[PDB]
Amino acid sequence: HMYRNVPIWAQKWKPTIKALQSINVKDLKIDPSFLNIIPDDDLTKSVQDWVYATIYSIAPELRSFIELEMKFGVIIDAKGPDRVNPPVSSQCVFTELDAHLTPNIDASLFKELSKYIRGISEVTENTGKFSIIESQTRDSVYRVGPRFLRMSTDIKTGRVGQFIEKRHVAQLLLYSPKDSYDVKISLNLELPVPDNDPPEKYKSQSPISERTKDRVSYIHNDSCTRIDITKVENHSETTHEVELEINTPALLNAFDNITNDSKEYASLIRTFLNNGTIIRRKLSSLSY
Amino acid sequence: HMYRNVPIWAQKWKPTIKALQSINVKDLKIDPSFLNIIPDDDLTKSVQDWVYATIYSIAPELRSFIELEMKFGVIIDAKGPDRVNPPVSSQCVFTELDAHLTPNIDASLFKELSKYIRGISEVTENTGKFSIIESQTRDSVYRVGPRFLRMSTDIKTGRVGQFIEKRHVAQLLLYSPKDSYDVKISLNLELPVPDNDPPEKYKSQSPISERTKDRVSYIHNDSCTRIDITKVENHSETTHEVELEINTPALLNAFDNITNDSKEYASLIRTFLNNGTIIRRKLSSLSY
Ligand SMILES: [Mn+2]
Ligand SMILES: [Mn+2]
């Protein structure tokens, strides 16, 4: 899995992702199971299998450009304008052809969640636990033939900080009927544009889409997660975006150690879902 | 909640069920989340909320007769003969008007899981942990006016060991689309018949349904669970019935301590769910 890439429909080893063992946590008053293991719940094994399939798909030489992110919105299907409404009542992977999710929560919950995360970062108990970056960028997209190169300019210093071809490799919709928002898990590739310099061919022609991004990012290094809260202006339609990002280097690293020590990858994935749940449930609790 | 009962649509205090805390388990290489807790998944929460609401709806003096169990089958809906197939791919609470499950699995899978569990009970590591109970009983159902009384005779000594009215209070269906069988959770009451003795009124008249039950019981006391493996002759259609049950006493006891210490209840339901998932995943790995 570390030196080769194999399309999902052709993959055959699924090295086993171990369940947590009844560890050293207060000799429990009750055994967790008759095997004394905690089985992963389905949805977590689903994520653990999808991420693994999808990284394995991609060429090794491309995996450092990976971005695994979770974003909130509402799932909408091909026929109706409203939130889907399958006959289920706890969060699941959602798989209907042409179901889609546009990253976008209500402004007031958006302001309310940002206050809450600030608040948590500002607790004296967590003064060394988050790192906050504020950042305001204009993202201009140039079509070439055709492929789209995303140029990111920041506003506070006209510097041209990021020039990529962003590719969406895969996505999983998690229909979350107990919550006011569903989530989209996206596996993207941020491909670095080569020598074709940002300034010399593009800072003279007309982008086909420009997006201003006002963001605060909370990075929680001990859970390898970064929360991004962003107002984006679609040059002008506005969206409120809430995204959790898992750290690519530690994800890469744990994915290369799957066969020898499955626990690292299985805990990273659990941790990412754990965070996205806090989020999701806090959004719903402000909705009431 | 311990001295009163309120109908599910009228309830208002849902006492918080605490999320596991990152306890003394191997100073983890990764934080569980940015709050240092593990949020319960949505399925486990759901079952948490439904078992609580449903207990609470029952009168205190009836609570000790509660039977809370899981069973294995396929969920069929009102329109068609096959397994439902809503657009979802991980296990979730399913809620469709008139979808039902009949407890029944394939008999070789049955024979293969019951060799699986007896093998685990016979492992040297678990020599003190299971208790096995074989029983053969014939269950006869007398209608009175109208109510259904269930009289159980065992076959190896014609004694009339159990006379009761079984009432189904509630149920929840867990649509399991990664597994070969889905699962029903049933919260029933086993009301013992008053002085109207079994012998003197009914051991003379015509039962409306009679069921022979060949059963093995594996009782795993430290995870407070009992597995029942039962062949049943429907006097004669045969069905193979795999049911797991949480211990009533321990359940009532954690229920009564929910406001003071949530952990006891949270732990028991998780344990229940973990043993379930163990059997359901064992079944599925035998169908392949
Ligand atoms: Mn991102
Ligand atoms: Mn039972």
Swiss-Prot record, chains A, B:
UniProt-recorded name of the protein: mRNA-capping enzyme subunit beta
Gene name tied to this protein: CET1
BP-aspect Gene Ontology terms: 7-methylguanosine mRNA capping; positive regulation of protein localization to nucleus; positive regulation of transcription elongation by RNA polymerase II
Whole-protein residues included: 241 to 539 of 549
Enzyme class: hydrolase
Catalysed reactions listed for this entry: a 5'-end triphospho-ribonucleoside in mRNA + H2O = a 5'-end diphospho-ribonucleoside in mRNA + phosphate + H(+)
Family recorded in the similarity comment: Belongs to the fungal TPase family.
Organism: Saccharomyces cerevisiae (strain ATCC 204508 / S288c)
MF-aspect GO terms: mRNA 5'-triphosphate monophosphatase activity; polynucleotide 5'-phosphatase activity
Enzyme Commission number(s) of this protein: 3.6.1.74
